[PDB]
């Protein structure tokens, strides 16, 4: 029938639209699942975390150009049911360390068990830039400032990043005694006092 064929064609067009929309949405969900699996593969649960930064020249030029202001590490934990933490890295630098130093901050994140943990956060945090020649690592460390809201129980999914700017001068990256960037990669290591 002429009428039946027009009706079927139109309804088929509607069905194709529905299929395209739903297929796209489920594709996005699949991407999210992939990123989540990568995140849980990268996570550690003992208070220490080894962050591998690849393509350091390209990323550093992106930070100087402003394409990527800062980088966030995968979330790691002090224990299986401890504090959710991550890192924020400024290659260009932040604040006083801007354009002169690597600025390295720790981020207290809203862990699924923050209700059972004591607050404020008070575990000593240690940052290290690892020399791939094992000559001299760049070590800094701090006790969390209790009066700062960055180390309180997170209200949102993340507190304001708190750490050390001026963590490492960019001049020492290409150091003569030892190069911290090797094969265009560098390694940052965070050690939180799990006690």
């Amino acid at each position: 029938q002429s009428q039946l064929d027009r009706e079927r064609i139109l309804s088929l067009e509607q069905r194709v639209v529905e299929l395209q929309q739903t297929l796209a949405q489920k594709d996005q969900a699949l991407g999210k699942l992939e990123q989540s699996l990568r995140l849980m593969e990268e996570a550690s649960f003992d208070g220490t975390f080894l962050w591998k930064i690849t393509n350091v020249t390209r990323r550093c030029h992106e930070s100087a150009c402003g394409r990527t202001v800062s980088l966030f590490s995968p979330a790691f934990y002090t224990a299986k049911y401890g504090y959710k933490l991550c890192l924020r890295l400024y290659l260009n630098g932040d604040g006083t360390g801007k354009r002169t130093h690597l600025s390295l901050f720790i981020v207290i994140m809203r862990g699924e068990y923050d209700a059972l943990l004591p607050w404020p956060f008070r575990n000593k945090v240690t940052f290290m830039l690892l020399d791939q020649n094992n000559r001299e690592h760049a070590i800094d460390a701090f006790r969390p400032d209790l009066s700062s809201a960055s180390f309180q129980r997170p209200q949102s999914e993340t507190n304001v990043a708190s750490g050390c700017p001026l963590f490492f001068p960019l001049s020492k990256l290409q150091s003569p005694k030892h190069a911290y960037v090797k094969d265009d990669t560098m390694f940052l290591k965070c050690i939180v006092e799990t006690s």
Partner: peptide, 8 residues
């Protein structure tokens, strides 16, 4: 060994 917050 005192934290310095980020620009946020």
């Amino acid at each position: 060994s005192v934290p310095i917050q980020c620009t946020d």
